Design an enzyme around this catalytic site. Sequence first.
Site, short mmCIF file in Angstrom:
data_model
loop_
_atom_site.label_atom_id
_atom_site.label_comp_id
_atom_site.label_asym_id
_atom_site.label_seq_id
_atom_site.Cartn_x
_atom_site.Cartn_y
_atom_site.Cartn_z
CG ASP A 1 42.32 27.85 42.27
OD1 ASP A 1 41.23 27.78 41.67
OD2 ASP A 1 42.61 28.80 43.02
CD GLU A 2 43.82 32.65 45.09
OE1 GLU A 2 44.62 32.91 46.00
OE2 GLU A 2 42.59 32.88 45.18
CG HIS B 1 50.78 36.83 39.50
ND1 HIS B 1 51.40 35.67 39.91
CD2 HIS B 1 49.80 36.46 38.66
CE1 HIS B 1 50.81 34.64 39.33
NE2 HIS B 1 49.84 35.09 38.57
CB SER C 1 47.81 36.02 34.95
OG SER C 1 47.95 36.85 36.09
CG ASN D 1 53.22 54.00 65.84
OD1 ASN D 1 54.08 54.55 65.16
ND2 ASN D 1 53.32 53.89 67.16
CE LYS E 1 46.78 49.45 34.64
NZ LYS E 1 47.88 49.25 35.63
CE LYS F 1 48.65 30.67 39.93
NZ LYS F 1 47.80 31.86 39.69
CB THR G 1 46.03 29.10 36.00
OG1 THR G 1 45.39 28.84 37.25
CG2 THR G 1 45.23 30.12 35.23
CE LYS H 1 41.36 31.32 40.44
NZ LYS H 1 41.98 31.08 41.77
CG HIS I 1 49.28 33.97 43.59
ND1 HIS I 1 48.90 34.13 42.27
CD2 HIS I 1 48.16 34.12 44.32
CE1 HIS I 1 47.61 34.36 42.22
NE2 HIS I 1 47.13 34.37 43.45
NE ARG I 2 49.25 41.32 41.23
CZ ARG I 2 48.96 42.48 40.66
NH1 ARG I 2 49.38 43.61 41.20
NH2 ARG I 2 48.25 42.51 39.55
CE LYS J 1 38.06 22.24 33.75
NZ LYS J 1 38.92 21.54 32.76
#
EC number: 4.1.1.39
Lengths: 118, 451, 456, 79, 79
Positions: free
Chosen positions: C187-188, C311, C363, C107, C318, C185, C157, C159, C278-279, C161
Amino acid sequence: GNVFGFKAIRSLRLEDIRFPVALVKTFQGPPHGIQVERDLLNKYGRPMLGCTIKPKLGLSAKNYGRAVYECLRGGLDFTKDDENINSQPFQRWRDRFLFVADAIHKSQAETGEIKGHY
Amino acid sequence: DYKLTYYTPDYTPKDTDLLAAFRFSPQPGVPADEAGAAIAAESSTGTWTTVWTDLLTDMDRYKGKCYHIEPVQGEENSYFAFIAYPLDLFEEGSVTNILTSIVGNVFGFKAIRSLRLEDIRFPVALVKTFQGPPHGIQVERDLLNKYGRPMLGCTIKPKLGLSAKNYGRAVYECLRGGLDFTKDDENINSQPFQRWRDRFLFVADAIHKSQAETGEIKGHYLNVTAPTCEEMMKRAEFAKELGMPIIMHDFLTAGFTANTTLAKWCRDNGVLLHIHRAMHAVIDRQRNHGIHFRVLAKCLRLSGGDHLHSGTVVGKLEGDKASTLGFVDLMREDHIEADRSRGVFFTQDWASMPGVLPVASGGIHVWHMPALVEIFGDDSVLQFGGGTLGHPWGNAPGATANRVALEACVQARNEGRDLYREGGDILREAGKWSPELAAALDLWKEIKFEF
Amino acid sequence: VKDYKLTYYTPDYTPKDTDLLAAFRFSPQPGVPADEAGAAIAAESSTGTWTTVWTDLLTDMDRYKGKCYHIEPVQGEENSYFAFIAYPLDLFEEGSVTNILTSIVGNVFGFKAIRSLRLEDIRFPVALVKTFQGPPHGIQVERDLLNKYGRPMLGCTIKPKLGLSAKNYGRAVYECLRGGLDFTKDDENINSQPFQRWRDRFLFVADAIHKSQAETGEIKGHYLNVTAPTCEEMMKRAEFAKELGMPIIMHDFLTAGFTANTTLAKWCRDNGVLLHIHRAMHAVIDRQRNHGIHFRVLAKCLRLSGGDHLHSGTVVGKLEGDKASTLGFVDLMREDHIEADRSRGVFFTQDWASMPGVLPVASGGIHVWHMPALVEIFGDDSVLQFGGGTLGHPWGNAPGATANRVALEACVQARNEGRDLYREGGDILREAGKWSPELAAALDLWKEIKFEFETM
Amino acid sequence: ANNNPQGTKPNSLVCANCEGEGCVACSQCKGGGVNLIDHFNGQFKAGALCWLCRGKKEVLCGDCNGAGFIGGFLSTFDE
Amino acid sequence: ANNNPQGTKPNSLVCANCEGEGCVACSQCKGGGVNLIDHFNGQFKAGALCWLCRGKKEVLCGDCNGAGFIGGFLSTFDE
């Protein structure tokens, strides 16, 4: 391990050893300790005192229980099973446990403290 | 792509659609309509086109649709966006799935400065597949047999470095005085100086003594938050075997899977569950990024819990006070109409699911008793910190002081008197037949102001 | 403590090697000084008092409290400071991440006299590292199990679909795995949902895995998502996935929590499967650079709790200011001793005491023209996930898998032979895309990069 | 084809290359549909189907990966 | 003494009321230790120990509960 069998030394003796904190922290340690043990007992200030029963072998379960009861009623705290009395043919373990529990409950309700038998 | 296919401004949402309201702030150069359509597409199949979805003509059954992008007044470069998700995207009984499906990766969008999730509306079709609170309000008020007044609790402040023997003695002193609940500190689980089985033993002993001595029903929240699920279940089973009526948990550090498991156990075994809200300012403190707390309160009422911390409202300016009243009404009541002045965005109907009990805490003393008693009403708990352990005489005198003050204020409210104007007057005419309340009124010199 | 130095801000204090250090970046309200704000952050994270009225009631104290031992201004920003705080070791339970979190960030983030607070790093002592389990397997054991040496691993992945039957799902998995990839992989956000329950998906995916692995002669896998409402459901899914003979599973460690992740990691250690983390829902915690919990803290807490893959996001696009931070916290979860270096975000020197490492997964919208860079930044101890760069090949899934495999092997062979990979990626890929139509089609579909002068 | 590395409209989010279509026309057959020149050695000879699009005259778009916009888990790098 | 706000010191987090002591002097026995008048008729009157502080000469500060600063947890969560 095998270091004590090394043939090029006459005698060897391990005198001490130091565990790092990193290794100490992965063991459980004592179940309770000293403070906790004292707190449940509620016995503060004095060293606890107890007795051992040397008229060891041949005693039935009931006479064992009666001796334990007489000793605990007098004012001791702990009583002790003989070190090499487990389940000999003259005295099995379930009967000893039964009669010792009976004596403990009697004396504890009679005096007013917390009694115990190892 | 002049047609957006995801911003349907004339679409009206069904009664089996899950609605969500975001407040977003787009990057410089990007308009608002396209940012709304992009928020709708990121939290679903992340495409505007139909080059994959048109596999065998199975289109637009699993996509969200933005249908309102009104702007927020006062601030500029900041808008509201309403989104409607179908019902066959979510599974039943899982809050983790709802969170993952909605807020999974939309917050990491690159074409927006900041994005906040303000409210959410669950259809009845989806509300009826969750268990809800183990007991509720009526059942948990009948189990404890305490009618017509708030409940009183105390938190033990000398948190660390206290043997289990002294801990039990302090709990016994407080409970014997007249309080109802004592609370275990949030971060006291199994530290090497005080393990949990000892604490549970001595606390149960104190509870039995004080309850058999005073005739009422006493309680102590026992913290069962553990490193794994096996330890959590061992602690809960032991606390039930001793005969304890209530436990504690942390739903934001332990997660929602552990909280749902504990709630189902508590329903099957007749224990009450108190939910502590540690680690909540990490998510919702800034007014421009995060997840507002009313969404988490709704998710909690869905997964399980009987009490919930909510924070005092005695010193908030406005709007914030209105917001807290709004999301207290969202917890206790059964049908809430849309009133944007106090936070509520959508009309929510709970389909006769039980309520949750608010808890106020955080350094309140006897002089705050009138206000609280007329803000939260009688369906709440009042937690006192230093307001009970700081009395000059001890712990039991502080308990009796708080008890006397509370009953005086509630008896004065029953007769029809006003608690805003003349609350301090009631406390003063009550602090004459009792020395403890007089000492308390003389120690806490806070008579700040009212009306 | 009005003019006294508060007994919580002791700049002449040096921390022991059994103290947990924490670094906060805070910005105080107008009027409030810096050292007082530091001491108040130190008092919030522990016994919430500056005085000795409560604590010293009958015996010793001042051993369960933190001490702000350093405060310094941030360069480039005004009204923004770094505070360092040192907590004892007796405050923390042995083997619990929940307790450390709720004891530090419990807190303090709601302190009223602070505009904003961020937790930038944290240092666990070895005495505390040794009470946790760590990753179920690690890097070397995992490599031995999959029997794949030298190169990074490849994944795909499915993804975009959502609404496929279970049989077509198994069919797509089979076409990908047969073509040349290593991992597929889920889907998440797929669970037991009305159009696709979990047991059907598990059955058909297992059948596809067995067929492809039998007819290709190497070990293949599919990350099955075992995230569930309760722990009974999670354990049911994991037991059934082990029964079918699956090597690896998946989990979400932020929406499900740390209790469920620790339980699952212990199960995986007992039963010998690998765990892929998986984040999700992380940008809610750490996106703004002024409030929240930076991600390296969560990476450390995951290496402690349990997990083999994690991940971490790519760095191909970047700035160096943040590419440095990402490389820093990628080294923070593979090596065994990391020296303090503020340019890469590492604040404290961390020693991991022979605990295994985790494996970074890169990824999100990458294609063949990135394969050079990715091979030389992350090295060969990593996994590469190709979402759209595989399923979008002009004539199928298996040709796309073959294209990606060919490109990866070409790049790693070229790196072994000594050639560069920043000034020589394009011609490497073009020379490899001569005797293979798949790679030629893949090179024509996407487009080159042309980074800058000669390098990054 | 176009040489936008990854670009949008001037203000909009719609990717400029595909104009939000998510699909472009084949650059080998120019939408014709049949191959024009022998390409590798003779296994792809003129007169038959196009060697790239397999006879659909329509392929996916690289910069915007099937998503009519720029940003998200399909077109950009995940942090 | 009866200043309404909690009153942090000027430009300082420390609570002004106790000046960071966490404790104040009893405003009933004037720090003496014995009563001065009769307060509750026939129970607490001059001669014996102070009725409030029980003869300890010091009580808790009203503004802050031993926190030593105003914006903490024992004091200021009264928003």
